[PDB]
Amino acid sequence: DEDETTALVCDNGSGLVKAGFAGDDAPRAVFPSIVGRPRHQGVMVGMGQKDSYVGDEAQSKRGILTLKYPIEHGIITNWDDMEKIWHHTFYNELRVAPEEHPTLLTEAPLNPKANREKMTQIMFETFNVPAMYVAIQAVLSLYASGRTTGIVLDSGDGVTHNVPIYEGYALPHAIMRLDLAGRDLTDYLMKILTERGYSFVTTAEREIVRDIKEKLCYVALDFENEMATAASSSSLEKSYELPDGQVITIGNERFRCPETLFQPSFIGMESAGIHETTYNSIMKCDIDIRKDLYANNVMSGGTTMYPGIADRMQKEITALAPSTMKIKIIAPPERKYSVWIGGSILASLSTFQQMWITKQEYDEAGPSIVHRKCF
Amino acid sequence: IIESDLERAEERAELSEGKCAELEEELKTVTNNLKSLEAQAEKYSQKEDRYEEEIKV
Amino acid sequence: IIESDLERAEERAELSEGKCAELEEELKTVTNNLKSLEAQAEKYSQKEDRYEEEIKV
Amino acid sequence: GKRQTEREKKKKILAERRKVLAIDHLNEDQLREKAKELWQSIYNLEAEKFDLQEKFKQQKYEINVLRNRINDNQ
Amino acid sequence: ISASRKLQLKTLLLQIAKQELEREAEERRGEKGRALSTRCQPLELAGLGFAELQDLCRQLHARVDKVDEERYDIEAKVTKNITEIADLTQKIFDLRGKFKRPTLRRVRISADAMMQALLGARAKES
Amino acid sequence: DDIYKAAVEQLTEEQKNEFKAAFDIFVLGAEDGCISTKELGKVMRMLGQNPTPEELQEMIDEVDEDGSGTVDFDEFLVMMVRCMKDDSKGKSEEELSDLFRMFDKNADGYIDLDELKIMLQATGETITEDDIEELMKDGDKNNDGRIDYDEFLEFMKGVE
Numbered sequence: 001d002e003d004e005t006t007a008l009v010c011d012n013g014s015g016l017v018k019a020g021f022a023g024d025d026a027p028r029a030v031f032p033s034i035v036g037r038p039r040h041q042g043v044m045v046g047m048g049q050k051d052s053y054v055g056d057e058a059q060s061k062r063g064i065l066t067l068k069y070p071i072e073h074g075i076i077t078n079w080d081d082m083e084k085i086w087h088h089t090f091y092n093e094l095r096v097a098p099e100e101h102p103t104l105l106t107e108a109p110l111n112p113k114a115n116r117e118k119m120t121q122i123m124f125e126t127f128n129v130p131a132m133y134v135a136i137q138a139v140l141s142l143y144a145s146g147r148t149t150g151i152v153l154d155s156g157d158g159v160t161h162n163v164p165i166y167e168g169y170a171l172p173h174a175i176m177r178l179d180l181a182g183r184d185l186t187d188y189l190m191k192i193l194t195e196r197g198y199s200f201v202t203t204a205e206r207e208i209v210r211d212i213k214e215k216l217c218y219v220a221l222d223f224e225n226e227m228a229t230a231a232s233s234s235s236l237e238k239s240y241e242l243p244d245g246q247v248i249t250i251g252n253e254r255f256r257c258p259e260t261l262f263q264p265s266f267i268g269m270e271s272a273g274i275h276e277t278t279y280n281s282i283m284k285c286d287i288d289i290r291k292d293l294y295a296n297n298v299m300s301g302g303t304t305m306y307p308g309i310a311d312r313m314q315k316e317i318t319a320l321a322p323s324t325m326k327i328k329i330i331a332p333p334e335r336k337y338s339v340w341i342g343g344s345i346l347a348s349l350s351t352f353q354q355m356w357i358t359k360q361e362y363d364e365a366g367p368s369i370v371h372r373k374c375f
Numbered sequence: 376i377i378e379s380d381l382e383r384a385e386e387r388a389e390l391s392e393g394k395c396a397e398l399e400e401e402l403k404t405v406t407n408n409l410k411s412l413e414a415q416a417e418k419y420s421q422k423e424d425r426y427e428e429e430i431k432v
Numbered sequence: 433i434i435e436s437d438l439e440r441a442e443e444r445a446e447l448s449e450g451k452c453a454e455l456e457e458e459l460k461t462v463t464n465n466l467k468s469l470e471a472q473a474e475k476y477s478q479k480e481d482r483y484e485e486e487i488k489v
Numbered sequence: 490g491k492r493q494t495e496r497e498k499k500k501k502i503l504a505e506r507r508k509v510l511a512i513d514h515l516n517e518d519q520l521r522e523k524a525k526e527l528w529q530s531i532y533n534l535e536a537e538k539f540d541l542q543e544k545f546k547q548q549k550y551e552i553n554v555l556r557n558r559i560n561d562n563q
Numbered sequence: 564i565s566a567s568r569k570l571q572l573k574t575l576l577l578q579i580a581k582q583e584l585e586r587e588a589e590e591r592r593g594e595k596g597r598a599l600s601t602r603c604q605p606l607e608l609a610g611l612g613f614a615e616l617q618d619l620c621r622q623l624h625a626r627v628d629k630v631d632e633e634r635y636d637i638e639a640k641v642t643k644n645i646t647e648i649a650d651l652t653q654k655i656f657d658l659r660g661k662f663k664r665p666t667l668r669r670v671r672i673s674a675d676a677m678m679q680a681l682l683g684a685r686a687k688e689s
Numbered sequence: 690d691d692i693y694k695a696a697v698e699q700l701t702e703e704q705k706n707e708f709k710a711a712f713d714i715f716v717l718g719a720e721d722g723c724i725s726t727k728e729l730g731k732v733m734r735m736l737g738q739n740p741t742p743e744e745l746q747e748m749i750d751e752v753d754e755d756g757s758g759t760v761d762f763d764e765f766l767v768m769m770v771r772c773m774k775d776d777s778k779g780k781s782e783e784e785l786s787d788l789f790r791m792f793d794k795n796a797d798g799y800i801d802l803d804e805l806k807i808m809l810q811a812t813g814e815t816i817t818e819d820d821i822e823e824l825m826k827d828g829d830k831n832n833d834g835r836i837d838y839d840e841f842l843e844f845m846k847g848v849e
């Protein structure tokens with residue numbers, strides 16, 4: 001299927017795995033990060049004895065399979081799910097073995113050392129891979145953006161990373177990760193819908209309402225004013241049609257769901273909102289480059305697909321920062337895949353072909369030394 | 376014969392309804408994006424007018 | 433009964449096809465207006481950036 | 490952590506079949522016949538390996554065949 | 564043409580198929596014999612001393628371990644292949660099921676009993 | 690129909706004469722000169738067992754070669770010889786895979802018409818072009834020029 005000896009770019013982002021060959025502009029195999037496990041034991045004869053579903057095979061059946069998240073906040077919980085999702089991506093979709101081409105994986109900023117050593121060991125010992133490389137997502141996203149300056153805000157599913165890069169310079173001391181993202185928003189919407197009257201307590205419905213949020217939920221331009229005008233609703237409340245057919249009616253809750261990002265007090269945490277944390281990060285940077293960080297801020301992550309985030313960011317930053325300079329916020333189209341796109345354009349360079357880590361040196365050095373070599 | 380005809384008409388209607396729902400979701404998304412673009416364009420227009428006035432001053 | 437069901441299925445298929453066609457025309461119109469508005473907004477932002485450079489100078 | 494132990498068990502499974510050999514209590518003539526039994530073991534081993542190889546080939550064809558079926562009834 | 568001719572052709576296909584399978588089995592046995600003769604060559608114990616036999620046995624043990632390692636790798640590959648084949652076959656079964664469950668009609672009454680009950684003494688050849 | 694017509698032609702002349710006599714007995718006084726659902730059910734009652742009407746239809750559909758909805762002599766032989774199940778005892782899945790492989794000698798996943806024809810040539814029997822076309826159709830369902838493994842599996846019903 002592939003006639004070019006190039007690394008397979010597999011972005012294992014929290015919530016959605018995006019795998020594809022280098023050189024492509026979009027991932028071909030896109031599936032959620034979920035593992036469905038046979039709950040009961042059947043006396044039936046003939047069905048697949050497979051004890052571990054994955055991807056679309058699990059999405060197609062969520063009532064029988066208990067759903068487990070292979071990644072939580074960033075820390076890898078179960079490694080069997082890791083081996084399952086890579087083995088599946090290798091021998092069920094791509095139809096190619098890892099013994100013929102490299103593999104450029106993308107990991108989140110500020111992750112545990114155990115996670116890195118574990119994935120590297122599974123990719124070297126178990127699977128025969130000629131070479132591995134771990135890369136931070138923020139750099140590849142800035143590559144795909146086509147710039148060298150700005151602060152990347154990557155909001156995945158269970159973690160949110162703010163990474164400032166000015167004039168092509170990483171700042172490992174300022175990268176601050178906060179576990180507020182799509183899962184805590186799904187939980188907030190679920191508890192407020194339970195407050196509305198429709199109560200559910202199973203994961204399949206949780207994924208359904210997550211999809212409903214992805215499709216409908218947006219960000220408000222003025223929270224309190226929308227609350228007041230929605231008190232007497234007319235066009236502000238919408239009636240959604242569940243894929244099963246049950247008629248759901250959702251009004252203001254939509255534009256109050258992502259608001260939890262701006263007010264973490266809703267989930268009883270002393271952490272500051274994403275905008276205030278980004279602002280504090282800007283103060284932690286130097287003054288000289290702060291204006292450039294204001295003018296080149298970039299966004300990444302699937303959570304940014306909601307309509308109305310750019311305007312909300314502009315008003316909040318204008319209210320926090322002075323209103324004398326110019327603070328333009330740029331969001332490139334299809335930003336979610338941009339990271340992966342970067343991977344593709346990063347795997348075609350010959351120099352990058354010279355910066356890989358082969359098996360033998362890793363085996364003698366050991367995983368810890370490999371951690372030192374990368375950084 | 377009539378059961379075969381019913382099955383074919385049902386499959387046709389199901390396909391049409393699926394495509395129609397996909398078109399509807401796309402329409403909403405594109406309409407929200409267009410509304411946002413119109414609002415932002417209006418802001419840029421008023422801002423550029425204000426900046427031309429400031430240039431004269 | 434199966435003939436009645438076939439008639440109902442044909443009616444629903446016709447309705448869905450008509451609605452899908454109407455939505456396709458609406459989508460084409462909205463995309464035309466969308467690209468026009470995108471061009472207008474790009475022009476406005478370029479003029480604003482020019483005015484900003486002039487203000488600084 | 491169990492996966493690391495799995496790789497360790499892979500090496501340990503290769504380790505279990507090998508055992509210490511003693512050449513001190515044997516004489517000149519016996520060692521020869523004993524060498525022959527080691528040789529037959531070698532022979533035996535390759536045979537099974539060969540079998541596996543041929544089966545592997547066959548199995549690969551199976552895979553190919555199977556793929557075609559999903560490409561004809563989709 | 565007739566259907567009996569097609570059945571005759573099909574059964575001839577089956578027997579010529581079986582003979583081909585036997586020929587392929589014999590060829591595989593021959594290839595196995597030749598590969599064994601090429602890989603594992605006999606020993607040469609004539610003229611070896613006490614320590615030389617010891618060193619030869621140690622080398623044979625090392626070769627034993629190397630071959631077992633290769634066989635274990637190939638067997639792990641074969642097990643992965645078995646798993647993949649089972650998965651793919653079951654998926655194909657689920658796909659191709661739909662409406663293709665067959666049976667042999669039971670109202671087809673056995674001719675012997677039917678022939679006796681219809682004829683009596685006239686039924687001798689059937 | 691395949692195994693049925695084979696068994697029919699395997700009958701002897703005296704057997705076929707008894708079959709014609711039994712046919713005349715069944716259509717004795719009939720109005721269509723053949724054994725329809727009515728006459729078949731009458732015969733079944735005369736015997737003892739009772740046949741379902743939908744079952745009578747499905748049976749007449751499994752013996753006719755003309756399209757009359759009734760059983761004539763040419764179909765009487767099939768209806769009176771179908772008792773032995775010739776297409777039973779299906780070959781093991783491994784044997785079926787071997788069959789597909791040796792019919793797919795060039796290792797491609799498809800039994801092109803060339804392989805089927807050379808196989809028919811190799812069998813030795815005088816292969817008629819009509820036989821080649823009928824077998825090619827029986828195997829290759831979608832008529833793309835080759836018999837895949839699913840179409841090959843379809844080729845095993847009525848075969849043993």
Ligand SMILES: Nc1ncnc2c1ncn2[C@@H]1O[C@H](COP(=O)(O)OP(=O)(O)O)[C@@H](O)[C@H]1O
Pocket residue numbers: 011013014015016154155156157158181182183210213214215300301302303304305306335336337339
């Ligand atoms: N099309 C979409 N619309 C809205 N939200 C989305 C969409 N796709 C993903 N998300 C949200 O983004 C999160 C997953 O983001 P992720 O795939 O990790 O981004 P990235 O791959 O850029 O790191 C989930 O919480 C999900 O709710």
Ligand SMILES: [Ca+2]
Pocket residue numbers: 723753754755756757758759760761764
């Ligand atoms: Ca007839």
Ligand SMILES: [Ca+2]
Pocket residue numbers: 792793794795796797798799800801804
């Ligand atoms: Ca072939």
Ligand SMILES: [Ca+2]
Pocket residue numbers: 828829830831832833834835836837840
């Ligand atoms: Ca075909």
Ligand SMILES: [Mg+2]
Pocket residue numbers: 013154155156157300301302
């Ligand atoms: Mg992200």
